[PDB]
């Protein structure tokens, strides 16, 4: 099926520059006009622009067409984000689209650019020990910028799963806890395994969580 | 640019409740205008394209209508796994705008938290920090009060709390308060217990542990 991944976000200082990328599978990207869509924490989505296949037509909003450039690589089917000097108004999810039909039929899962003068932090991770119905969990504590992403023994274990909103400490970093609740027979038999990833620090942690 | 406007920006319903949501164009746009659906922490996702088709896998309660400058999304019976955002967006002129959204929520009945406390682990305390954890799982309303005592006391700070969104499956929140202390004042105390408060309790519920046990 059509797959869209983006890459290349995380942190960037007030007026840097960053280029995003969205590697993609499952279709003729050569044949398909590519675009770029953007949405602020707890706001609506926001048009960038759009390239067609030979890259001889590029649109952009009027209002964003100095602080992105939009390319392409057709033999790589890799699409282009170039963001120059940012501001804090562009602190936001990019979202590479496939323009069909026009509509926006398939979406990536987004890449969040944080713009801050603040410094990267990898978090620690620590287990939340069960002790008909059982819950345990992990703790991932102490990270900047965000988002981190927790799963379940690879990705295998999804119901009962309650992943929370990071929370800003005094100190100025993100701190988040996950929960599941299974059944309390499983405990001493069923293996669980918390799946943390923060990739602006590129930290990749497996905690196994027993009672 | 053409100004897309939604109404209602925001609504609560019944499973089992007919939905309509409007989107105006600033101008007429002919039958170029689309739909999308996002669901708390997932990626937009398209439901209808050209006012009315629906695109491959998507529900069939779901329909579009309209032409010009006013069109109309129905969700003929609501259901858990509708609780999400919907976009409406034209495709007619350059540069391609949105609606501003539709927050759709879920009204349900009364439902008690199953509440869960989790003392610091043995790895935390080791660089010389303790985390106690409260869990508040599945109710319903949102509304819910957690208070933390220490040997009885009640503690007057280092906690904070967080809160999900409308789970898709039975329209529940859950909650989680972290009191974060140094393993010195930790040391200090033996009973830690979380008192819950909400509409599903006939009395407030207690969770608690001796530390060390």
């Known amino acids: 099926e059509v797959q869209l991944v983006e890459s290349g976000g995380g942190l960037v200082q007030p007026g840097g520059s960053l280029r995003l990328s969205c590697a993609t599978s499952g279709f003729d990207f050569s044949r398909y006009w590519m675009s770029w869509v953007r949405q602020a924490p707890g706001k609506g989505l926001v048009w960038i622009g759009e390239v067609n296949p030979d890259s001889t037509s590029i649109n952009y909003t009027p209002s964003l067409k100095d602080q992105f450039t939009i390319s392409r690589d057709n033999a790589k089917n890799t699409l282009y984000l170039q963001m120059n000097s940012l501001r804090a108004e562009d602190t936001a999810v990019y979202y590479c689209?496939?323009?069909?039909?026009?509509?926006?039929?398939?979406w990536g899962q987004g890449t969040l650019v944080t713009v801050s003068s603040a410094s990267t932090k990898g978090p620690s991770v620590f287990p939340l020990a069960p002790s008909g119905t059982a819950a345990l969990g992990c703790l991932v504590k102490d990270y900047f910028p965000e988002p981190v992403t927790v799963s379940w023994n690879s990705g295998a274990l999804t119901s009962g799963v309650h992943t929370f909103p990071a929370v800003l400490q005094s100190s100025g970093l993100y701190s988040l806890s996950s929960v599941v609740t299974v059944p309390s027979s499983s405990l001493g038999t069923q293996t669980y395994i918390c799946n943390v990833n923060h990739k602006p620090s590129n930290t990749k942690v497996d905690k196994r969580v027993e009672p | 640019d053409i100004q897309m406007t939604q109404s209602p920006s925001s609504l609560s319903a019944s499973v089992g409740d007919r939905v309509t949501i409007t989107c105006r164009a600033s101008?007429?746009?002919?039958?170029?205008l689309n739909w999308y659906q996002q669901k708390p922490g997932k990626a937009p996702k398209l439901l209808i394209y050209y006012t009315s088709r629906l695109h491959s896998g998507v529900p069939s309660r779901f329909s579009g209508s309209g032409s010009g400058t006013d069109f109309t999304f129905t969700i003929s019976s609501l259901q858990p796994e509708d609780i999400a955002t919907y976009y409406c967006?034209?495709?007619?002129?350059?540069?391609?705008?949105f609606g501003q959204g539709t927050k759709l929520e879920i009204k349900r009945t009364v439902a008690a938290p199953s509440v869960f406390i989790f003392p610091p682990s043995d790895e935390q305390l080791k660089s010389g920090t303790a985390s106690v954890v409260c869990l508040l799982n599945n109710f319903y309303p949102r509304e819910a009060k957690v208070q933390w005592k220490v040997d009885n006391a009640l503690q007057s700070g280092n906690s904070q709390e967080s809160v999900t969104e409308q789970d898709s499956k039975d329209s529940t929140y859950s909650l989680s308060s972290t009191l974060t202390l140094s393993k010195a004042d930790y040391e200090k105390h033996k009973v830690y217990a979380c008192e819950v408060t909400h509409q599903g309790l006939s009395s407030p519920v207690t969770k608690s542990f001796n530390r060390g046990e």
């Open positions: 101008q007429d746009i002919n039958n170029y």
């Open positions: 689209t496939r323009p069909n039909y026009y509509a926006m039929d398939y």
């Open positions: 967006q034209q495709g007619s002129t350059l540069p391609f705008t």
